[PDB]
Amino acid sequence: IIQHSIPAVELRQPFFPTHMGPIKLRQFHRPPLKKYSFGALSQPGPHSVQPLLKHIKKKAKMREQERQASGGGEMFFMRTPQDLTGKDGDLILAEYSEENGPLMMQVGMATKIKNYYKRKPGKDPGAPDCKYGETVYCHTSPFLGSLHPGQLLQAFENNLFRAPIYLHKMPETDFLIIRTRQGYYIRELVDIFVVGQQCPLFEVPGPNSKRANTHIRDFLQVFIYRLFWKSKDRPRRIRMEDIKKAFPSHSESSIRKRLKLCADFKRTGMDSNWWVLKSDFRLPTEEEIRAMVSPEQCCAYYSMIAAEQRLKDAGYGEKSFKIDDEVRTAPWNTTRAFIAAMKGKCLLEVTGVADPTGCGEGFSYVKIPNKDADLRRLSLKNAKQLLRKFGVPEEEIKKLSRWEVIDVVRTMSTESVAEHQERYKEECQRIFDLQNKVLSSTEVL
Amino acid sequence: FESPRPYKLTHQVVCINNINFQRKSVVGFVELTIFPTVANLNRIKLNSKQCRIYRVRINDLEAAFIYNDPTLEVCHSESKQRNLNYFSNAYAAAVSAVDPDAGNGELCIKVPSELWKHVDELKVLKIHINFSLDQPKGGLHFVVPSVEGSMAERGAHVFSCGYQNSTRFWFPCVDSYSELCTWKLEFTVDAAMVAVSNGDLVETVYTHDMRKKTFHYMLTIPTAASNISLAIGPFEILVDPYMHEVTHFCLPQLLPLLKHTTSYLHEVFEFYEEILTCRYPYSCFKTVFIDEAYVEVAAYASMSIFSTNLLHSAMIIDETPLTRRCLAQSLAQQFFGCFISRMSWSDEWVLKGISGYIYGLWMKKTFGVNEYRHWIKEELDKIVAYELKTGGVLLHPIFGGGKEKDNPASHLHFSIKHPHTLSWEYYSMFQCKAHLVMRLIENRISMEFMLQVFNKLLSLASTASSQKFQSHMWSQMLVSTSGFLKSISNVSGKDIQPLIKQWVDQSGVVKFYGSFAFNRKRNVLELEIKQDYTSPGTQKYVGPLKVTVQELDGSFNHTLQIEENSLKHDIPCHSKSRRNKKKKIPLMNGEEVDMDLSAMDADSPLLWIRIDPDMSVLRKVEFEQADFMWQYQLRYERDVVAQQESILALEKFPTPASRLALTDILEQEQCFYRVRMSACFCLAKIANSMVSTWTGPPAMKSLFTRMFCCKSCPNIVKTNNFMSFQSYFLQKTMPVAMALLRDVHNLCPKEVLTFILDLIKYNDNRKNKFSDNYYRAEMIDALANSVTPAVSVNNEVRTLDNLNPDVRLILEEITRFLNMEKLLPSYRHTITVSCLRAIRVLQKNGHVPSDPALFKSYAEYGHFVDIRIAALEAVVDYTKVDRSYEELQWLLNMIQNDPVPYVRHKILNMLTKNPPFTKNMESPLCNEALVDQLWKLMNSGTSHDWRLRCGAVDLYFTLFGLSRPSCL
Amino acid sequence: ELESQFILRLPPEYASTVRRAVQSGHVNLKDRLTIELHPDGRHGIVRVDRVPLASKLVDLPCVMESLKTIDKKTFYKTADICQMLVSTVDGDLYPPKKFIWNHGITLPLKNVRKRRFRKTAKK
């Protein structure tokens, strides 16, 4: 059960952007350092970098006092945008080994660490303790490969993806700098995780699909409703200009579709007009708006339009998405391949072109399906001598039922659907164990 | 936030002395340690009734004394406004003035000017009150067997049952809830008779060394005054061995009955501390069984005292649910009378809500999850039945302050600020709506978050308790509705205030006219169903919800709802399931195996309609499907709710023989117990419609044939069919439904009558180790369900024919069982209860004449509770049908005069349920003097208990309710 | 607005001095450590105890996420980090493709651009 922060669940801006340009899609989850037009740090010259140690201890004390005053147990603290800052609380860094993951969390979303451990045979004293995460004892492996007895494997867990994580040490030269309009902030941090290839749990849509087009419509319907809740006029009213500024890629006619059922147009003698909320329309409450669009659905759409921009930059037009190799690496292709393979509908390519590492250290998420005369002329005696020659044990030579003998010698001269799935498991296990070895190694290259 | 009550309290010491068995009196002194709040607190008020004070004292200074009783009659005894409304309003205002939650008076000691200057100096005082209870007429009980020479010593006991605010009736206090105090309790008791109250055994040797003993129970744990009760007399048994500290107190010659009874309690403690993540937050736990019960449930601090009717001694199978059911009730309401506490009567509903939900969670992981859902169906049946009888049961945060009413729920009585106006129907539905509002909190908030909430509540309770009495920082154990709502919103803030304003603050039962339409019957539109509702009188408009549709072989389709309920809605459509001879099972629900093209399967991809199968909304859903869909629901469905609602819907109209076949197929599997009870009732109702349509055999003989093989059973099933309780409940139920099988010539159940006679012949010895009692009782009930009203054509009532022919055989068998249970008696004379119900049914059919003298002789004092309650139900229905005014006069005089409260309770309850003298149908002339005597019995002679005049308020609800009685 | 975060890399003696200053928690670190960015947005000067170190803003190849926690089990993502300001003891303090960093911060992610990144096939 994942409980996101309140600005994440409330679909708030700029945590959930409404529209992203071609520049923003290339810079998706890589925000460039941008100058301010006003404020303290819009000025030239050196700027003070302030410590946080008193602020961290004070906030941790206050949150503990709020826990003990009602009167203990588990308390939810991520209620405001101010609570989501990096200025307070215990922090990690997480470095994704994938350049562009199929699913990505936004600022404000939540994830868990589960410490997957397979018990040793006989008398297990228990899993080793870790600084982070909750221990989960598993008999069936949640990954593509199987855990070994006594093996502890840390992993990120949320509604988007599953991916193994590896605790490393932050280098002694590297610090975390928090930069705002008001000043520079610095905190010490030692714990950094290397995150492997994701096992996606939520489906990424294709471009201009019915699911994708429903998501854009619903997200527009969510954004319109919260504009009415922001309006202080009685009766409530909004402007077309505010929606078009947030949604420059929509035509006004598509916005006219979403506004006709809930609002009435009142024209005024100025090029700035209002949509007045219908008196007989009950505006939906906050948690009803929450059920319309989830944070996980936005990330699946965000992954699509960013990857669609990357394919257009690579020369692939919309008619390409019989299929090209790079189009197979798209997240709408990889996640549909993996989830169907997770549900037992098909198997995976694993050694193939959709390997994100490019050197054999990852998985390729591409669907593959789940798919005598002369021996009987041997005239028992020569078949007996042949079974003696191959090294067949003397019991089978001794019984010498001739049909059984010829079936055994055909089997030995052979030495198919149980081998097909076993070779899939062998290929999965090899790269899984190889990925465990490389990304956890402290070798200096 | 804080209580609007001055004069905070810390300590109190009771000392019962000279407890008498002949003049039956109690003397004692009480000790209060008081921190007053404000100056000029002169008229300090305590409250009690039936307590003659000997002296009051504060630090060797006897101050003034005020003793009023406005809980008695109107200040003018002949107030001619003898109606419901004026008496209800005046009684509500008067007993609110009895309550000290204002400047009021019942026991106002006046502080003298010397002690007023002391209060001006120091607001710390002690209160020493010497007083005496008389022969207790509503505050205690002295159960004494009528021997009085020697067995009054060994055989009698002394206790106090009562309602929540019955601590007033026992020893003088405040409004007895919501005063966090601590107690020292001194008990002058006999050496054999053991006193049982709250607290701990802090000082007990052979005390005072003269002739008797004296017990010191100290309650250091801060609770309220409405948890103290003193059972004196029973015998000590530790039934410890699993948890080492569970103590029990019961009357002699009942002790191995406890040795079987108590166990499985440790499992309930383990599950409750899996819930709460604590220990049992006390030293020990006490339980007393007693042959009387004001309330069967009653649960106090570290102590449960209730009836000696729930022993269930290892052979009496049909109290396998009931015993630990009532133990779970007396542990849950215990736990929420201990620490978590209301600030007012309107703020209570959280408490019994979470208690009933906790023993519902106990009913989850102990026995019968499908029986748990059947219990939820019984909860909805109770709520829909009562709030279609009367108005809603509303859970107020809003007062009527400023002499205001604000009560649409005042169809009878006041409800906001006060307990002792309500009825037990209203109180039971208060608890039932508390159950289902907690299920709505399940439906919007996860169970793990509820565990977090409840752990937070008990963390604040245990932290705020067991300390040095932190001044001004101690009322955190008042965890009423507002702060509890704030704690829920701090854990998970959702639209739970709309849930309050729907179900907590708008008391309405919602029917559902969800009209089935059929699209994709090769139609343009695709799988659409209309939503509709309007049914006034008691209605409620509930909007955004979801709807569950099961396909032929497919997905659970869930569909939203809207307000403005003249609606049309869609389904997230199934595929076109065509070539269904090839599409045999495309994953209906897992690996279930079912194949029927017997339905209207030309163009029908739908099977069943459902709105919230987890039973969120207080609902009464009315719709129509094809009959094949209803009958295909009864071959298999994963909801006992769906099975018994299809059972009701197919009890209404149909009679094909395929219905009988599918019913018999459903009755021969492993599905559920009571589904087959109501399915045999389906067979009864449908074979009653087989008068001209007798296609099948005489039913349910082949069901006993094909299901029960003792030694292959050569045409008769006889012996030793137990240790499989499926067959136990089924053989208990089925001949009752067999006796209903009637086709109209003379209704002629003659083969069934002779077969039931042969079954009554063929009973078992001790090879069955299971005390064959209830099987006999329900077969006698089947004899009672052999109603033959049309024998006496002209005058055949009065020993003409020695009335004939099978009624005499039924009289022979009920005579045999009455005299056997007079000689054998096996477990409570339950056979005698069924026989008296049979004798009343025979009096209702004119065979045995309508004479109450047998029922009069079984409504006498020295019998069991069940015999007396059955004879009193019988004489209430006798006064209903026949015009016996004299037995009604005797019934009202016994309402006035008897020591047992529960028989008065149930006389008033089922006299309201089964009324004679019906309003605006007045042929037996209530106006003569019965209105006067009922007005007297409301005013006088009813200061014993609150609930007896509550039942009399229910009587004037039924009898001439919102008007003059047409006297003058 | 979204909070901007980036990695600051120092020479090891200066990293140890600033690390002791951060662990000490004294306010005067706001004077002991300053950062100045040039108008080109790529070069800068990091001053440690008024000592200038020539700094270069480079783009990290791997997307990095910084996450906060209270109970060390459920984590809340705070920021995306993709840039690092690297301070050197030599180099032009006022300088008149080379800002592409090739390596991960962690040990196994060495040479990700050349060895562990599948390269896009054009056309």
UniProtKB/Swiss-Prot annotation, chain B:
What is one Gene Ontology biological process annotated in the Swiss-Prot or TrEMBL record?
A: positive regulation of DNA-templated transcription
**Main subcellular location:** nucleus
Expression by tissue: Expressed in all tissues tested.
Compartment list: Nucleus
Q: Which GO terms describe its molecular function?
A: chromatin binding; RNA polymerase II general transcription initiation factor activity; transcription cis-regulatory region binding
Protein origin, superkingdom: Eukaryota
Keyword Transcription listed: yes
Q: Using the chain's own numbering, where are the disulfide bonds?
A: none
Q: Name one GO cellular component term.
A: nucleus
Q: Which UniProt keywords apply?
A: Disease variant, Intellectual disability, Nucleus, Phosphoprotein, Transcription, Transcription regulation
UniProt keyword Ribonucleoprotein, yes or no:
no
The record's misc note reads: PubMed:9418870 was unable to show an association between TAF2 and TFIID.
Instruction: Report the family membership.
Output: Belongs to the TAF2 family.
**Role:** The TFIID basal transcription factor complex plays a major role in the initiation of RNA polymerase II (Pol II)-dependent transcription. TFIID recognizes and binds promoters with or without a TATA box via its subunit TBP, a TATA-box-binding protein, and promotes assembly of the pre-initiation complex (PIC). The TFIID complex consists of TBP and TBP-associated factors (TAFs), including TAF1, TAF2, TAF3, TAF4, TAF5, TAF6, TAF7, TAF8, TAF9, TAF10, TAF11, TAF12 and TAF13. TAF2 forms a promoter DNA binding subcomplex of TFIID, together with TAF7 and TAF1.
Give the disease entry from the UniProt record.
Neurodevelopmental disorder with feeding difficulties, thin corpus callosum, and foot deformity: An autosomal recessive disorder characterized by impaired intellectual development, microcephaly, delayed psychomotor development, pyramidal signs, thin corpus callosum, and foot deformity.
How the protein assembles, per its UniProt entry? Component of the TFIID basal transcription factor complex, composed of TATA-box-binding protein TBP, and a number of TBP-associated factors (TAFs), including TAF1, TAF2, TAF3, TAF4, TAF5, TAF6, TAF7, TAF8, TAF9, TAF10, TAF11, TAF12 and TAF13. Interacts with TAF2C1. Component of the TFTC-HAT complex.
Protein name in the entry = Transcription initiation factor TFIID subunit 2
| Residues included from the entire protein | 20 to 987 of 1199
Swiss-Prot record, chain C:
**UniProt PTM:** Phosphorylated by CIITA. Ubiquitinated by TRIM26; leading to proteasomal degradation.
> What is the annotated tissue distribution of the protein whose record heads this document?
Ubiquitous.
Q: Can you say where in the cell this protein is located? A: Nucleus
What job does the chain carry out? The TFIID basal transcription factor complex plays a major role in the initiation of RNA polymerase II (Pol II)-dependent transcription. TFIID recognizes and binds promoters with or without a TATA box via its subunit TBP, a TATA-box-binding protein, and promotes assembly of the pre-initiation complex (PIC). The TFIID complex consists of TBP and TBP-associated factors (TAFs), including TAF1, TAF2, TAF3, TAF4, TAF5, TAF6, TAF7, TAF8, TAF9, TAF10, TAF11, TAF12 and TAF13. TAF7 forms a promoter DNA binding subcomplex of TFIID, together with TAF1 and TAF2.
Subunit text: Component of the TFIID basal transcription factor complex, composed of TATA-box-binding protein TBP, and a number of TBP-associated factors (TAFs), including TAF1, TAF2, TAF3, TAF4, TAF5, TAF6, TAF7, TAF8, TAF9, TAF10, TAF11, TAF12 and TAF13. Part of a TFIID-containing RNA polymerase II pre-initiation complex that is composed of TBP and at least GTF2A1, GTF2A2, GTF2E1, GTF2E2, GTF2F1, GTF2H2, GTF2H3, GTF2H4, GTF2H5, GTF2B, TCEA1, ERCC2, ERCC3, TAF1, TAF2, TAF3, TAF4, TAF5, TAF6, TAF7, TAF8, TAF9, TAF10, TAF11, TAF12 and TAF13. Interacts with TAF1; the interaction is direct.
- Which protein family is it in? Belongs to the TAF7 family.
What else is on record for this protein? Answer: Overexpression of TAF7 in HeLa cells inhibits cyclin D1 and cyclin A gene transcription and causes the cells to accumulate in early S phase. In contrast, depletion of TAF7 from TFIID complexes by siRNAs increases histone H3 acetylation at both cyclin promoters and stimulates cyclins CCND1 and CCNA gene transcription.
Q: Which named protein is this? A: Transcription initiation factor TFIID subunit 7
Q: Which residues of the full protein are shown?
A: 11 to 154 of 349
